[PDB]
Amino acid sequence: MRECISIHVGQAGVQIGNACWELYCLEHGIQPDGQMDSFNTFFSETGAGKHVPRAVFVDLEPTVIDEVRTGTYRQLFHPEQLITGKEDAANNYARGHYTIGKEIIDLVLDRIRKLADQCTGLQGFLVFHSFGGGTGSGFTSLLMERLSVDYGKKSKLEFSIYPAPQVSTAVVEPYNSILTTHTTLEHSDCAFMVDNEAIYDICRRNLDIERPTYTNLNRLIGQIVSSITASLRFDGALNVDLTEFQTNLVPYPRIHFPLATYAPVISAEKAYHEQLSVAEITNACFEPANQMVKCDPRHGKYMACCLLYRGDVVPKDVNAAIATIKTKRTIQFVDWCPTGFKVGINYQPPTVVPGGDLAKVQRAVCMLSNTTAIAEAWARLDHKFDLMYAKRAFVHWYVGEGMEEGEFSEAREDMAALEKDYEEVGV
Amino acid sequence: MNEVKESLRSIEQKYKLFQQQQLTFTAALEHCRENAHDKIRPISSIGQVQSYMEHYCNSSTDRRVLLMFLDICSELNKLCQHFEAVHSGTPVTNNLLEKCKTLVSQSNDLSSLRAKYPHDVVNHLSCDEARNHYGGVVSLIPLILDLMKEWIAHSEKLPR
Amino acid sequence: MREIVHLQAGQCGNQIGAKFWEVISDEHGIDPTGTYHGDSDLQLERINVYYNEATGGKYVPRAVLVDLEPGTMDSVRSGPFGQIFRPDNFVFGQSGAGNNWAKGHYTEGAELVDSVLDVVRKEAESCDCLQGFQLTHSLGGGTGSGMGTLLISKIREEYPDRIMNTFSVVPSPKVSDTVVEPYNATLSVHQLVENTDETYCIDNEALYDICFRTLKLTTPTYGDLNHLVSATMSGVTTCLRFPGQLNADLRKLAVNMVPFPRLHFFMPGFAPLTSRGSQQYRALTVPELTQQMFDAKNMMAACDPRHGRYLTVAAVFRGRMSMKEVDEQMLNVQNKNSSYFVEWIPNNVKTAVCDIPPRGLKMSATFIGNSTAIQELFKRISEQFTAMFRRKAFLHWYTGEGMDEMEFTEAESNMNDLVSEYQQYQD
Amino acid sequence: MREIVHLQAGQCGNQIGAKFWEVISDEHGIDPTGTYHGDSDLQLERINVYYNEATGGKYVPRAVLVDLEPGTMDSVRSGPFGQIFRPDNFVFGQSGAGNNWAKGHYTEGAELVDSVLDVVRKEAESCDCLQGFQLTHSLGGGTGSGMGTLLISKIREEYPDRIMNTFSVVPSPKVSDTVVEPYNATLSVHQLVENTDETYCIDNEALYDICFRTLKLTTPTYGDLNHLVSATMSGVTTCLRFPGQLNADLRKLAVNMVPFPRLHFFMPGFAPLTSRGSQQYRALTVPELTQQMFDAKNMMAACDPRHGRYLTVAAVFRGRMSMKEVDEQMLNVQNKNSSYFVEWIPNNVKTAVCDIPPRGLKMSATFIGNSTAIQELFKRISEQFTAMFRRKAFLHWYTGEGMDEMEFTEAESNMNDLVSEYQQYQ
Ligand SMILES: Nc1nc2c(ncn2[C@@H]2O[C@H](COP(=O)(O)OP(=O)(O)OP(=O)(O)O)[C@@H](O)[C@H]2O)c(=O)[nH]1
Numbered sequence A: 001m002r003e004c005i006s007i008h009v010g011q012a013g014v015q016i017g018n019a020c021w022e023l024y025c026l027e028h029g030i031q032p033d034g035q036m037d038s039f040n041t042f043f044s045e046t047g048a049g050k051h052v053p054r055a056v057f058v059d060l061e062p063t064v065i066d067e068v069r070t071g072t073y074r075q076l077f078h079p080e081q082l083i084t085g086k087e088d089a090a091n092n093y094a095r096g097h098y099t100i101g102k103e104i105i106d107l108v109l110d111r112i113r114k115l116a117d118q119c120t121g122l123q124g125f126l127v128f129h130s131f132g133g134g135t136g137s138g139f140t141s142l143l144m145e146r147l148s149v150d151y152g153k154k155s156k157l158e159f160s161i162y163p164a165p166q167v168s169t170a171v172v173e174p175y176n177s178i179l180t181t182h183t184t185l186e187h188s189d190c191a192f193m194v195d196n197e198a199i200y201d202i203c204r205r206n207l208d209i210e211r212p213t214y215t216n217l218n219r220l221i222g223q224i225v226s227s228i229t230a231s232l233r234f235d236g237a238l239n240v241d242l243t244e245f246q247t248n249l250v251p252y253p254r255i256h257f258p259l260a261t262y263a264p265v266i267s268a269e270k271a272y273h274e275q276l277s278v279a280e281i282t283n284a285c286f287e288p289a290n291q292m293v294k295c296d297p298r299h300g301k302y303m304a305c306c307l308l309y310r311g312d313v314v315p316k317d318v319n320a321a322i323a324t325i326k327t328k329r330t331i332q333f334v335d336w337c338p339t340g341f342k343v344g345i346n347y348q349p350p351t352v353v354p355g356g357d358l359a360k361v362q363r364a365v366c367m368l369s370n371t372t373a374i375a376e377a378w379a380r381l382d383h384k385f386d387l388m389y390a391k392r393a394f395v396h397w398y399v400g401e402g403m404e405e406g407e408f409s410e411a412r413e414d415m416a417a418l419e420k421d422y423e424e425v426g427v
Numbered sequence B: 001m002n003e004v005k006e007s008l009r010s011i012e013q014k015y016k017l018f019q020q021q022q023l024t025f026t027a028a029l030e031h032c033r034e035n036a037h038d039k040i041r042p043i044s045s046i047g048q049v050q051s052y053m054e055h056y057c058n059s060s061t062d063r064r065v066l067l068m069f070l071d072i073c074s075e076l077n078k079l080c081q082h083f084e085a086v087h088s089g090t091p092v093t094n095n096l097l098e099k100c101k102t103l104v105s106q107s108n109d110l111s112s113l114r115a116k117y118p119h120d121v122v123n124h125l126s127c128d129e130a131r132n133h134y135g136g137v138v139s140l141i142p143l144i145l146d147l148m149k150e151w152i153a154h155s156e157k158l159p160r
Numbered sequence C: 001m002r003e004i005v006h007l008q009a010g011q012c013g014n015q016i017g018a019k020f021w022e023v024i025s026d027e028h029g030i031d032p033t034g035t036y037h038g039d040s041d042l043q044l045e046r047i048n049v050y051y052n053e054a055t056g057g058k059y060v061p062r063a064v065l066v067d068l069e070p071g072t073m074d075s076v077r078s079g080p081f082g083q084i085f086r087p088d089n090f091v092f093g094q095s096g097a098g099n100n101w102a103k104g105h106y107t108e109g110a111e112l113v114d115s116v117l118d119v120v121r122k123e124a125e126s127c128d129c130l131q132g133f134q135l136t137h138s139l140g141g142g143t144g145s146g147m148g149t150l151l152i153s154k155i156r157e158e159y160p161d162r163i164m165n166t167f168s169v170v171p172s173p174k175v176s177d178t179v180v181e182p183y184n185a186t187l188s189v190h191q192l193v194e195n196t197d198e199t200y201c202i203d204n205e206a207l208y209d210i211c212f213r214t215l216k217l218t219t220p221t222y223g224d225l226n227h228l229v230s231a232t233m234s235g236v237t238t239c240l241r242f243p244g245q246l247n248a249d250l251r252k253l254a255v256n257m258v259p260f261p262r263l264h265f266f267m268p269g270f271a272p273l274t275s276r277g278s279q280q281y282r283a284l285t286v287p288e289l290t291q292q293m294f295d296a297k298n299m300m301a302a303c304d305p306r307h308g309r310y311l312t313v314a315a316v317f318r319g320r321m322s323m324k325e326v327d328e329q330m331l332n333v334q335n336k337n338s339s340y341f342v343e344w345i346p347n348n349v350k351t352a353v354c355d356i357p358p359r360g361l362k363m364s365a366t367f368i369g370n371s372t373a374i375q376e377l378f379k380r381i382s383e384q385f386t387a388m389f390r391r392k393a394f395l396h397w398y399t400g401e402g403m404d405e406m407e408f409t410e411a412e413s414n415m416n417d418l419v420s421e422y423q424q425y426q427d
Numbered sequence D: 001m002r003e004i005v006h007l008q009a010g011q012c013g014n015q016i017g018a019k020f021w022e023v024i025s026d027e028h029g030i031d032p033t034g035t036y037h038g039d040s041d042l043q044l045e046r047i048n049v050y051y052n053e054a055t056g057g058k059y060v061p062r063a064v065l066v067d068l069e070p071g072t073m074d075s076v077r078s079g080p081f082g083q084i085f086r087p088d089n090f091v092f093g094q095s096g097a098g099n100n101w102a103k104g105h106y107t108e109g110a111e112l113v114d115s116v117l118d119v120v121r122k123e124a125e126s127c128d129c130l131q132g133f134q135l136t137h138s139l140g141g142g143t144g145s146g147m148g149t150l151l152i153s154k155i156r157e158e159y160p161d162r163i164m165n166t167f168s169v170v171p172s173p174k175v176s177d178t179v180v181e182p183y184n185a186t187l188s189v190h191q192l193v194e195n196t197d198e199t200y201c202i203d204n205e206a207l208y209d210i211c212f213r214t215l216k217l218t219t220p221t222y223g224d225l226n227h228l229v230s231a232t233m234s235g236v237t238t239c240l241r242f243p244g245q246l247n248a249d250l251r252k253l254a255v256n257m258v259p260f261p262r263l264h265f266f267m268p269g270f271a272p273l274t275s276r277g278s279q280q281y282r283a284l285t286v287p288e289l290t291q292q293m294f295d296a297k298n299m300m301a302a303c304d305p306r307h308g309r310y311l312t313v314a315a316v317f318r319g320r321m322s323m324k325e326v327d328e329q330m331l332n333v334q335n336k337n338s339s340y341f342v343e344w345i346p347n348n349v350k351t352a353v354c355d356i357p358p359r360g361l362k363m364s365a366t367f368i369g370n371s372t373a374i375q376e377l378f379k380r381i382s383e384q385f386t387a388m389f390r391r392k393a394f395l396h397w398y399t400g401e402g403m404d405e406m407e408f409t410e411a412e413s414n415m416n417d418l419v420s421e422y423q424q425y426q
């Protein structure tokens, strides 16, 4: 009865989805052709026995769908689940929302209707997008808005590319980053974020690989993603639901931006040479080195935490290991909730892939948390966005595109509100 | 064995070029089938492919790709004679040589053949198009290369 | 899928355009006749960008060449790559502009362009998704400057919302090879700033300087001078046509490089200045490259970085290079260039990675930027244009044709408007 | 039950350290690959003192190594038995010091030790209850004397009441191998006397003397020399690991032979020695040990003990022997040698008996000693240190790195209180 619809928009997010859906075919053991009820959640049985994922990859540019059309996994997908627009938004929110974004929004929801009708009872949607460019930012906004109007109360989870503070390949990213976070404030329910720099950084001091690619970035991202939705897919000792950590990780519906962490993140010879125990997979989660968001957990306070386990683990240690964590002094939670956890256990370990660079491990964990550490990280991000408006730079591109001059002043008040709302929490 | 192996490496480079131009080869095969207006039966004969290229070839690039594929097949047939005179072989070696002759035979079919595990021709071609129309023409080269590598390994393990 | 039309004016780009279309034909494995002998089908997916198909499996150029002196047309028609252009692309007039802006504009230009504008609908309407137009022209030659700016006027009004890219050679400090250069350039830049989206500035003197100090070519003939200029604009356009790990279309460069509407003059560069005798003496490494994109010698204008001010920088990388080493070293160089990049736009740069290299080279980088010191390139003209009008030079070649003297005084104010804006927003 | 940590400092510490874990991995039956293949079951019972359990019957040392020369650390990486060491257990720095005490402690000390404590706490919290620490440092080397003190200082400030059993090499008359060795040795003692639980003054010259006059090797390279030093360490630390007829764990060893909070230098000795002339002519019995126990040919420090007295002497005899034979051999010489020992502490020897012999050997004997003959070694160390300040020479490198001259004089305030305290009871 449990199923999902996956959406991929933006050449960051859709390029993740290639290796993301690489894992699901390998984990469920289904060939790239699609031929041989844990697999009913995502794939769709053709009457001949072919499995088509219920995933839609929409981007306004033909440069990446054709990569999927010329990828290894061509035979996996339905012909119409890949819808390509004419011209990409090209680092422009309003162009991807007003002028270009209105062209193929009717085409995506037509594919949404068809994937909705196949589900007589639906758990949630999974969009994948980025905050940097135009198409994965601008289109995903009103795509989220019209699914909010059309569908009442189903689970809405967002995986977004967070803009790293130091490195940022886009130049008009701060106009794109703020305008998307305006739209997600009122109709987005769960917003997982990954930022580039810590993903680049942490795979250096742990994986020790001198020359990686974005494929390494995706599989590092992928096991974070798969561990979130492994609870739906398979049975285990203690299973959670999509709506459950939605209630957990979002204590206040105005604040719905948690971060992500994953462990064990170690290489192959190290896992050979270091012993894999329950104690060592949970202490690294509360080390600050493995924090894959450019913020300080020492600065922030863990408001609501989610823990999902993988591999071989015993719940006696789970109750034992958390007792070490609560008695620590460097990790400081909030005062108003000493019971800030949500711990789950799944038997299925993560699996290495052909062409991968990670290790095969005995047990695994994804560390999720809601904290105020990004507010100080957004203080720098607001400083970047403040500096773009003192000299009134870059406005004239958008003025003829369709948006208003006062919309930046309202969005300035919105990020003032969002920073103050976190500042009301920490009191 | 090095004299035949130089031609084997040249054929390996040519097969890499054909694998890169697999999409162009598939488009040429589809255009030839549309021009011949006989899509009921799958492509099964090298002679049928040569007859398709002689009359029902449309584009210059398609003709060049068909000529390259036919030249690769002819080079394989020419190197089969040089590989035959290398060693006397065992009964299994003679059976494999007869299999190589049947695979290089134009009159023998190709639809029942399938791509090997290292090859990604099945992972590249369409489901129905390779299942029922033109899978064997794409898959014939990698199976022949695997058979040649197996024969070379068998001769290397066989004392002279 | 994505198509953009090239118009040609002046004998200058007639010498680039033979070399410039050599490289794109070389990159796509095209014989001088125009047919195909290649290795992969990957280029054929987006070979339709600058060509059209022909019956019999042939590919025809999207490049229209116009001049009022028919000498360079036939030479291009009889050149090394002369049998490739389709024979209505050539349009030739009777009375050349004679390095006079007036002569090629009103009394002789108008008769040619109406037949030329009919060729524009023949080429534009063939394309399905026509993004815009490019035009290679000169500021020193009369036909490329005067008749080219008329084309800039006519095309934009009829096709309002497209992308206009101009690769223009600019006058130099010491290789001044025409007497009327501040008359020719100012009567074009009065309309270049007004009506052009993308403008690229090419300095002759730096090109002579590049082939001497680092290439050490013995006989730098104009084939060598056209070689790098083609290669720079070849690398600009390969992100639109060839897929990479991180892509950027032409408007993608257009949006972020241009903060203010009147400042769209770009300063480019090409990275592997490797010599003919020291290829094996260079470690082919990206830690060699970044000090080569930002050295005191690798620029393509008379604009020193210590005499300049870097607003925006695009570093398009081409080849098979690792992601993390490039992204950290791009983070490296912005830090140590504390006073060289601007301060009021943090995270100035865009990295762009295209997977496929140029032929015969592992990795390749193009450094493209906007600097204020293009006004110092302009102030050499500006100190020369104002004093020369005071002594009443060369009026009869212009005012004998029919324009009033007042708009010439507007030009020295409008050219003063441009350098006023660079100086005002420098601080 | 009880877990232990091995610090290491200096390039000379690597060769001592690498031979140490080479010697003690053999005595439990461990290959450099990491697969146990042995018959003795008592080794795996108490293997948890040193190593750390891994998957598939593998065990990884709790050895922490700190240095400023990757080239010898690369050799430790390329060493045969170094392939069992844990990767992040190595702490190696890219910048050197230059055989001076200040560079390792102040300038390069501000960054490398932050990578040390993370390795320590990673190893510290995985243990049951940590018995203490060992560090093999030096007095003649600049880097080993430098960070070794700061390794001592911050762990003592982090760990209030544990054991700190160190092994330090002292200056010698004729094996003087550094000019600023009297500069490096004296101020290192300043951090030792206040802040160290145990240190064992092993002297190089006797190690050369014993390989020449006593072991009679034709070409005894340093691998022979570290073979003595490692076995002296293991004789101290075989009672904590192996049961015996008279057991003495390190804490009561630290209680017994440290009578005073400061005068806790030690002078080792370990003589199951056999020359290549004499494989069979010896009569290996408990009585022959006792004559060999106090012969000057067997001890590690180049000093003549007839110019003083032994304060405390511990004779851990490891092997199969009877307690009535053990004590009576020393009981006679306590009565007989009424002059060579101190008179204010009667019954000058308290022993310990271990049952399991070392591998490749039948019966072996150790020695731990504090004595009133270490004045003249401490006296001669001080006398040049005073004399090196009269001409004030060589001090401008330490002075030029931002330091005070008084810190050279404050050690002479502190070292003179060390030698005058030995003068008080003598
Ligand atoms: N984590 C991750 N981020 C990426 C990757 N590729 C690009 N990005 C991020 O994506 C941002 C740019 O947005 P795009 O990926 O181009 O998405 P978009 O909104 O559709 O913009 P267009 O693709 O040009 O239409 C950059 O700032 C990068 O940080 C990737 O492979 N992994």
Ligand SMILES: Nc1nc2c(ncn2[C@@H]2O[C@H](COP(=O)(O)OP(=O)(O)O)[C@@H](O)[C@H]2O)c(=O)[nH]1
Residues within 6 Å of the ligand: C009, C010, C011, C012, C013, C015, C016, C067, C097, C099, C138, C140, C141, C142, C143, C144, C145, C169, C177, C178, C204, C207, C222, C225, C226
């Ligand atoms: N670097 C370079 N400069 C050129 C080239 N061709 C022309 N020029 C410059 O252009 C000016 C003459 O322009 P020309 O080509 O005659 O344009 P036209 O008169 O409008 O047809 C000269 O001052 C040259 O410096 C070329 O191939 N390379």
Ligand SMILES: Nc1nc2c(ncn2[C@@H]2O[C@H](COP(=O)(O)OP(=O)(O)O)[C@@H](O)[C@H]2O)c(=O)[nH]1
Residues within 6 Å of the ligand: D009, D010, D011, D012, D013, D015, D016, D099, D138, D140, D141, D142, D143, D144, D145, D169, D175, D177, D178, D204, D222, D225, D226, D229
């Ligand atoms: N026991 C022992 N001592 C050594 C060895 N090698 C050198 N030494 C002593 O160490 C001293 C030099 O120490 P040094 O290398 O300068 O210390 P570092 O600078 O901290 O590495 C010399 O006086 C030697 O007597 C060895 O292999 N074993």
Ligand SMILES: [Mg+2]
Residues within 6 Å of the ligand: A010, A011, A012, A013, A133, A135, A136
């Ligand atoms: Mg994108």
